[model samples]
Target chain A: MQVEQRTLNTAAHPFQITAYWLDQISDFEAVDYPIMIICPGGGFTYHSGREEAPIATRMMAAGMHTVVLNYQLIVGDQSVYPWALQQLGATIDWITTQASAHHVDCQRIILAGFSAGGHVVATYNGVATQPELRTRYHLDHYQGQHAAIILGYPVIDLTAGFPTTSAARNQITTDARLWAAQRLVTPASKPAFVWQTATDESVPPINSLKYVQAMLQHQVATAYHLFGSGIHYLNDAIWPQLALRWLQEQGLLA
Target chain B: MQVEQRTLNTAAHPFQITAYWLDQISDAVDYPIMIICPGGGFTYHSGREEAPIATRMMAAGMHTVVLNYQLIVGDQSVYPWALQQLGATIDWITTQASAHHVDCQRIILAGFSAGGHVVATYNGVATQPELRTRYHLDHYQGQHAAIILGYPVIDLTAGFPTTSAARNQITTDARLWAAQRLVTPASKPAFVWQTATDESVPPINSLKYVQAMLQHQVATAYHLFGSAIWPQLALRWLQEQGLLA
Candidate 1:
């Protein structure tokens, strides 16, 4: 299989954002493989090659055109949630516009996020409360539909209580307020796959459980994976051995 | 008085590890600040509640602790590299230990992971391999010292690069291999702070640069503002503001 990868230039960020197109030789002419977009997290300050790049490459081998988005880092000064949401929203638009060139199956698009990135993907699945995020990045507005959402031990509720040992209570409360005020109601149109560990010490495992529960409550198609072991960032370490099996069993790999 | 926080715990898998003193806060004489730990990203596996609870409450005038660690997820299996280079490694053995812990001068103790959970904080720090030595959970064959790690982000190269899109030749060969290999040699120790953002993207800024440079690097010491505009987790988004500062 020959893979064609390119960088997309977006007005949101001056830097070139990378996008990859992977297709088997036989399917190259068809140009209809699913597309996956990977988002990296750095508290919106830095671009992450570890999480984005590695994942982009692996998705390519599965005969899918994988694009890693390098959206603007939402730091305090240039912070604009609507703008960031627009970038992702527009990226999907651009992908559909270039579907033929990239050999992507515009109908089947999967959004995946790790940690903070997971929130982004979830928002893409309709979890944003911000009107702009809803009006701008909502996948429902786009021609393509969300095939699946892969959320890795995400921080779902900013308002949740914490033991005395945790830090930045005010920040948590404030973010929770903002998130609650701005969180998008999940649309029934999309299916989701959530993965977390019971021992997750950074982002609580309950976040995933709750998210899955919410999705189920909403009657949205969803799959939840809770591991007994594995620490944060250890997902890749055990993905191939354990999580991969689950993904395959779920028919996500096929 | 200025406040500070620290996160203490083991990086071992399948084990319920806890910091010695963290468990005994009620008996302490002075109120210690908190450090919030965010787990590392291979697949967002570990949960650093000790650090999260500590930091969250400390921001509201209480003391706490936390750590960022790498663990197993997805189709990959946990490896030694992820276990050894936990944020805890940076805390007890590295220089940041002193800067973050207000009482480092008064009490220096070691903290252990998994099998070493019973080990004293002083012993945990002492047993750390000062010179490229393997981290052993059993006997303390290494040096002993006090440790105070605040939301550490450690180890990357073990089994990352497992994402589905990364498996393709063009994507995988071009970037994944080299990046995954950078985990061990690139791991570093440092002080981490949280910030607030209007957007909610994962905070890989600190880890990304360190992975590329193959060493530990520090951002501004005491700034609540993030340098760029990417979406962040609600926790990090809150930290970026003066809320955690």
Candidate 2:
């Protein structure tokens, strides 16, 4: 296996974004393996290469050339919802364009998000509803669709009614309406699995449960597992252990 | 391992709901146990005897006399939620009533449900908000304060939304809205573990999960294996056999 690193151009931003690719070698016959694009969450404040990049290494071992997307996280005045969405979409387009050369399967792209990243991936699915945003992001050109969404204690609901601590309530309201609207209109293009804990203090369990319920209600294929114990940010230990079991259950793994 | 079965009367019903007790013979030492409640989906048209009784037997063999509650299934009526919650609570109450006869420190209750029954158990949780109905299901006195819920797949959302075909258009609606609101309220009283299939067909992964566990021994071999193990066990087993061995 060979790993390659590169950057791609976005519509508004010149320097745009960064991504990594893992390649699989075959002698006689070749097959396009799956691709994983990970979005990390730091309340949109900083890049999370440390937390998100490891997912790429794992996927590469699973017969996938994983792509760790380094999109702008600040959501600054100029960089808002569609900007991040565009950056992700642009990353996807960049990868799909190299399908024939890199042995990538455009159809087998898995969009994964953690914490606020879950909202980003969910927003990606919602972007399809807006024709202008879809065209602007060039999402319309991508032949690929999200195969699965692996969320880790994601902030799913932004509505006022959902639970949020006083310190995080204002943060939760950042794009609450837009997030809620996106949730309402967003069609889940792929199956989703949510791993959360009942004892999570940073992000309420309601966050994952509400999203799981919404996904289930909309008839979107979803499975949610709520563990009895575990603190927030325990994903390092919990995710690898539980996700491996869940991935096998879903037949996504051997 | 003496098994004693008794009946109790609730405010809502009369049949004297059945309760199974595994009593310890020696009074000098005490044994703690849990009441195990078997889920039967909302159709409650079925009895809780099979798994409920078996769990008690297992507990008794471990030197703990497990209690099995044969409470009424809610059916279409609102009573099922209260009955299910109280059944577990009352079993604890009864355990305390007999604390001198058995060990109170070891008492724990467990429940597993599938399909609509999953939502029913969720409703029984103290953290969730009250149901939208005119009557209040939460007013009941008995709560499963020390119980454990094992592998519950509660679906307050109707239909099997886990299928791509079914999930396409219905992802957002008032029905889902209601279910979301119902599940949002936090319940911390009981320890819970929920499991579902990623590609569940009937929106019934929760239901089938419980069914699989209940019928594990006698069910068809393929269905048994398909439902019994999580998807990746085979690979892990293979890895172990090849590497560890």
Candidate 3:
């Protein structure tokens, strides 16, 4: 196994990704491992340490190479809008570039996000899969596309209430159209595995419900689970296992 | 295991329950009970949803009872009477708990489609004793530990019956409709599952109920799959709830 952190300097902001890659061996020469790029949540302010290495190890155990992408966050007046999305595209582009060296299967690339990170992942799916949005976000140049996405206690709708104030909400994005991820769903969206605890006070379970509802409306393949216990970031044991099972159902895992 | 069909005679209607009992070898043998209510749009009981589902749940090591709840026939309404009948069924189970070798406290309710309305409404009324009395179920002394709803008709007004006549057969009182609105903080923990493409009962039925459960901070486990595979998911959920050892 090999672990390393690499930085990608974008036109707007430079971001970093910590990769956990398994050893390429002659014993498993035919197996090209799937990759999961994790986006940790911290309400657009900071990346959560709790959602990083531990989650990577769990996915790694399921025969996946995991990478923790540190996207641009809200700093002073710098918003988390186009920059975060662009960095995600850059990370995806970068990972595909490293595909042969790390034995990474670019076709099986999966995106996992927590809370606000879920916002980023979902919006990226909306933009990346739609031709118009793809052109708008300049993601047409990126050579990678995710097979699916996993969202944990996601923040889907901004006005459904999370940032607390107008000023605080503006730190993430002032664009009214980008406030709700559920509204961005189209037929082009990919399969999604989403989970949230019903008791989550920070980001309500309604976020996951609304997104799943949209996915159903658009006929996008989706599996949603709202667990019985735990609040935001409290770490319920069942979702990770469920996510792996869903990934296998999507044929992204063996 | 003993499998027997028993009849309970009530004033409004007589209902039958098929019991699948686990054999008791020792005094410590007390298995959880799953009382199932099969759905048929409140007009009749679905045989397909009854025995087959009961047998599947029995594999999880619990006693199972399939309730042929009261249905709407002629001018008969399946409202308060169906609710009362469920209470009576629970009372009967409580009375026979010792002989049946079942744990009364670990009783779980599993309802499908229209039957889910019964269990969903029961989750609300039974948890709050005053509502039980208001519905004339004070004589029943049994309560469900949890509930399982499968492709349920949660809100009667949510485009299920297709006609006012069919809706009227269930209840004339608007208050009795929409089980999701009736949920309070005292509502029992629920495991809700449904197919996204269910044309009979829209998946929103389960979604609304689960959302309400979340609002009240009730323990709720929900799954909305693109296709069908609820039995396995529900059985795993039952184990997660500690109903099966």
Best by DockQ: 3
Candidate 1 accuracy as lDDT: 0.42
Q: Is candidate 1 or 2 superior in lDDT? A: 2
Please compute the TM-score of chain B alone for each predicted structure, in the order given: 0.26, 0.47, 0.94
* Cα shift from native, residue A19, model 2 (Å): 4.9
Whole-model alpha-carbon lDDT for candidate 3: 0.84
Error of model 2, residue B189, in angstroms: 2.2
lDDT by residue (A125-208, candidate 1, tens digit) is 663323454544443454445566676666565444222233433322223323421144454436666666544565655455
Interface RMSD against the true structure, candidate 1: 16.7
DockQ of 2: 0.09
TM-score, candidate 1, is 0.43
Which one is best on TM-score?
3
Worst 10 residues of 3 chain A by lDDT: A229-238
Model 2 gets an lDDT of 0.48
Query: What is the lDDT for A88 in model 1?
Result: 70
lDDT of 2 by residue, B1-245 (tens): 44444554444443323334445455345444445445544223234433443454344332322232333243223333343444445444554545434444444444554323333343333434444223344444343323344444344344444444333232222333122233332332333334433333233433333222222211110011112232222212222222111
Docking class of 1: incorrect
Q: Assign candidate 3 its CAPRI class.
A: acceptable
Task: Rank candidates, TM-score, best first.
Answer: 3, 2, 1
List where candidate 3 sits over 4 angstroms from the true fold.
A25-31, A231-237, B27-30, B59-61, B73-75, B128-130, B197-199, B226-245
